[PDB]
Amino acid sequence: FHHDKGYKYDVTTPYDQRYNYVADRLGHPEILGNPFERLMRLEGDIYHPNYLDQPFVKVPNANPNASLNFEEGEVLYENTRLLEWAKFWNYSVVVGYLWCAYFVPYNIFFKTHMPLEHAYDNLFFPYFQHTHFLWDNNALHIPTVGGVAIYATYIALSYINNIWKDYVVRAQFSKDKELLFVTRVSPFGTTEEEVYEVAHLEHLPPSVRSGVKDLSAQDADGLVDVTCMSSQRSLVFYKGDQYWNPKVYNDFINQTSNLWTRNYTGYNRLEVQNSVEQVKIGFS
């Protein structure tokens, strides 16, 4: 044992005796890193060998479980037009962003010397013009403008993608119907594919019981949000019969609706006695 810091009850659990990962069957390639961030020599906390060397349990295998079969199956849900909408909105925002962030500031900052009204309406200076060259001799505005442009564009693109990341462009079962391949919107409007386990998908009731009235699913053409609980992600489907495959729709609905039960409303005078199962003590 560490004679300066440790105790004699310091016995390492061997890697054989540690608990295997059984929570899910899908692999978790984050522990590998990426060829990109291995090439860039980036150090991440999620693929550090010391932190992945858990002493009591095992981290999940990077590859999916050998029992899983990834052969294509029945198509469940298909709303492809979302992609187009995605493109539209994304492109619109970008164009608007450009017009509202670069063209107008550029034209009113470099292509004229006359101020606009909002530059001096609250000031009590006499009227004067401005020049780009008699100010900021040591150019501290150049790094500021560059950083603002870079990070504003990054934030805009990333959060636009995050907003669209809930919606499901397409959802197709596996052959054994144990997996759901979900095509979603990429940052630039095209497709990106993910995989989920149907066992982890649940249509969870709201935490606030009074907010069930204020749901999209109340409408006949609203949205149905199904939570993947092994990753805490959301699958937003259009609840219109034209977007669904009738041959698998009822099975999917039955498998995903298990926690939205009658207890969510409460127990009446008769069900309160059956709310729990009695614990019998001393009967031996």
């Binding site: 060829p35 291995r38 060998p49």
Partner: protein, 35 residues
Amino acid sequence: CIYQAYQNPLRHINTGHNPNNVYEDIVMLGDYPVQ
């Protein structure tokens, strides 16, 4: 760590946080763990 191997490269992403001549990364430049 010069001529003496104190650190454990099996427990570090990047060996080379300190000037040394006795350490080598387990995942080298051309190595990429993949599925």
